[PDB]
Design a protein around this nucleic acid. Structure first.
Ligand SMILES: [Mg+2]
Ligand SMILES: [Mg+2]
Ligand SMILES: [Mg+2]
Ligand SMILES: [Mg+2]
Ligand SMILES: [Mg+2]
Ligand SMILES: [Mg+2]
Ligand SMILES: [Mg+2]
Ligand SMILES: [Mg+2]
Ligand SMILES: [Mg+2]
Ligand SMILES: [Mg+2]
Ligand SMILES: [Mg+2]
Ligand SMILES: [Mg+2]
Ligand SMILES: [Mg+2]
Ligand SMILES: [Mg+2]
Ligand SMILES: [Mg+2]
Ligand SMILES: [Mg+2]
Ligand SMILES: [Mg+2]
Ligand SMILES: [Mg+2]
Ligand SMILES: [Mg+2]
Ligand SMILES: [Mg+2]
Ligand SMILES: [Mg+2]
Ligand SMILES: [Mg+2]
Ligand SMILES: [Mg+2]
Ligand SMILES: [Mg+2]
Ligand SMILES: [Zn+2]
Lengths: 123, 53, 44, 112, 92
RNA sequence: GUAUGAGUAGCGAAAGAAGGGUGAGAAUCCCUUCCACCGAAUAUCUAAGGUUUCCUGAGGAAGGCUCGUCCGCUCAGGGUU
RNA sequence: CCGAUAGUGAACCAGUACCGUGAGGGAAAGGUGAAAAGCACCCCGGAAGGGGAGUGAAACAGUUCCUGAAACCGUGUGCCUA
């Protein structure tokens, strides 16, 4: 099945959407072990939408990605959003690799509460 | 719901036989040659599987 | 709910103040016996 | 010739019972391995015990001129210190006692 | 009081000296001195022409120095501004 | 004064996440973005009451039901026309 | 006659701190050393705290500091124990 992360079905839905957007924007983040074993599935299912390139696939992924600016370019300074980067930058990278677009590296316990922290990175 | 008799020293020491904590599963690093946890990124030389991370 | 002590600056001086003790024969006896103990504060 | 060195941390805020559980791991081990054990044990007493062990090694070579590579943790024990007495307001007007305990930590290193 | 008894000492701080160029001078005066007495005390000592005086009362701060508790003195602070066609006071 | 119960009960209504910064040390301090809660109030004034708790610069022994580089806590200067 | 649970409630900033709306109730708390000579300097540590060196008759007299019992908490070991 799937694991509940100490929060109700509404907090859990929001938590997975913030963490999946951060991995797209930053490509390398600090989380806990259980919290990273879960976004390992919602992110790779999101690259697969980016590898389609459809309008149907883009509209389906737009219901999950948060609306935030990755960075601003002067093409005319126009911002670039996370959905644009997923479909134009991140997805074309893995046009040949079938699966496993992420990897997890263990770091060690956290001082405050002893939680096990890991690196999840987008390669 | 209330202790009938106070606990002696021997009985209080027997119960704490199992309240110890185990030894960490540490290992010698291949690159920098010092201690680290298995299946973990080395905190000193910052390497795992022979590649810097 | 609500408690027994409801502070008020005026209500305290009008009942326990110095000029209230000095106005009665038995109020001057309270000050006399508090001076006997050598208490730091007389009246309120 | 002394052949041993010691360091003491007096009136450390940690409670004696919570520090004795970490001392029991490093007793009788080599100082090279004993430092790693305290580094990879996720308890609050590990940083405190690790500075006492490192200080004992420090004056085991500056004061008595011994080898860092031959030292072992010969002795390690935790004593008690003066406790701080506090209170916690409980229900229905009653108060309960709280003991903020301290401890003394002693580590002795020597040759093998 | 006398002129020298009403006025005690100037106040030299960051706020006090930031208004010297505005022809405003801050003093510590007697606790029982009215606003009008401060006006004529200044003109007797410094021979300036006084336009306004503003006064305020300060309480005493509760201070501790080890097992001992007490209060500092209560202050009365006066700010004197002078007419533009008059001399100045040199705090220096 | 110190034990046993015992490393046991509890830690006092609630949504947080990531990236930078400071630092000996960061889930807990600062900044940014996203998300969430109140909105005849959990918004704005003002009496009573409390008396310096207000501001700035340093601090981390004790207090803060954890942590603390932080604070309505400690020290020194100020502030009410 | 007492000698710091004694002797005044108070040998110490005591009718104080604290408690109560108020009248009122009301504590705990003495001892470094003959002399501060109260640890220059070095090492670990952010600090606290330690290990040397030094003062001292004594530092196992180092800022609740003469003496330091019992409960209570530990480390090592000779004999016994599933
Ligand atoms: Mg809902
Ligand atoms: Mg009345
Ligand atoms: Mg009174
Ligand atoms: Mg109550
Ligand atoms: Mg006025
Ligand atoms: Mg039980
Ligand atoms: Mg249970
Ligand atoms: Mg809470
Ligand atoms: Mg008022
Ligand atoms: Mg403030
Ligand atoms: Mg704390
Ligand atoms: Mg600092
Ligand atoms: Mg601060
Ligand atoms: Mg303050
Ligand atoms: Mg007595
Ligand atoms: Mg005696
Ligand atoms: Mg009172
Ligand atoms: Mg020393
Ligand atoms: Mg020192
Ligand atoms: Mg010595
Ligand atoms: Mg000598
Ligand atoms: Mg003597
Ligand atoms: Mg003694
Ligand atoms: Mg004894
Ligand atoms: Zn390594």
């Amino acid at each position: 099945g799937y694991r509940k992360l100490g929060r109700t079905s509404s907090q859990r839905k929001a938590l997975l959407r913030d963490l999946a957007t951060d991995l797209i924007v930053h490509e390398r983040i600090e989380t806990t072990e259980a919290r990273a074993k879960e976004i390992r599935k919602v992110v790779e299912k999101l690259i697969t939408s980016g590898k389609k390139g459809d309008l149907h696939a883009r509209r389906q992924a737009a219901a999950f990605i948060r609306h935030e600016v990755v960075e601003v370019v002067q093409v005319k300074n126009r911002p670039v959003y996370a959905l644009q980067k997923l479909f134009d930058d991140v997805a074309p990278r893995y046009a040949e690799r079938q699966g496993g677009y992420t990897r997890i590296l263990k770091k060690g316990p956290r001082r405050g509460d002893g939680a096990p922290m890991v690196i999840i990175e987008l390669v | 719901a209330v202790p009938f008799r106070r606990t002696s020293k021997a009985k209080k020491r027997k119960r704490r036989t199992h309240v110890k904590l185990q030894l960490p599963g540490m290992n010698e690093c291949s690159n920098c040659g010092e201690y680290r946890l298995s299946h973990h990124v080395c905190p000193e030389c910052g390497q795992y599987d022979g590649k810097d991370v | 709910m609500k408690r027994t002590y409801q502070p008020s600056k005026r209500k305290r001086k009008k009942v326990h103040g110095f000029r209230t003790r000095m106005s009665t024969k038995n109020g001057r006896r309270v000050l006399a016996s508090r001076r006997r103990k050598g208490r730091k504060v007389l009246s309120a | 010739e002394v052949t041993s060195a010691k360091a003491v941390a007096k009136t450390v805020r940690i409670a004696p019972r919570k520090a004795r559980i970490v001392i029991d791991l490093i007793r009788g081990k080599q100082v090279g391995e004993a430092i790693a054990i305290l580094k990879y044990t996720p308890r609050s007493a590990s940083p405190i015990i690790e500075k006492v062990l490192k200080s004992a090694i420090a004056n085991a070579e500056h004061n008595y001129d011994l080898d860092i590579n031959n030292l072992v943790v010969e002795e390690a024990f935790v004593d008690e210190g003066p406790t701080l007495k506090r209170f916690r307001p409980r229900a229905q007007g009653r108060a309960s006692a709280i003991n903020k305990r301290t401890s003394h930590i002693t580590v002795v290193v020597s040759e093998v | 009081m006398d002129a020298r008894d009403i006025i005690k000492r100037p106040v030299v701080t960051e706020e006090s000296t930031s208004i010297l160029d505005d022809k405003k001078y801050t003093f510590e005066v007697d606790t029982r001195a009215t606003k009008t007495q401060v006006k004529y005390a200044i003109e007797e000592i410094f021979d300036v022409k006084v336009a306004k005086v503003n006064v305020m009362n300060y309480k005493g701060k509760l201070k501790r120095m080890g097992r001992y508790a007490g209060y500092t003195n209560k202050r009365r602070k006066a700010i004197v501004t002078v007419t533009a066609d008059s001399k100045e006071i040199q705090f220096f």
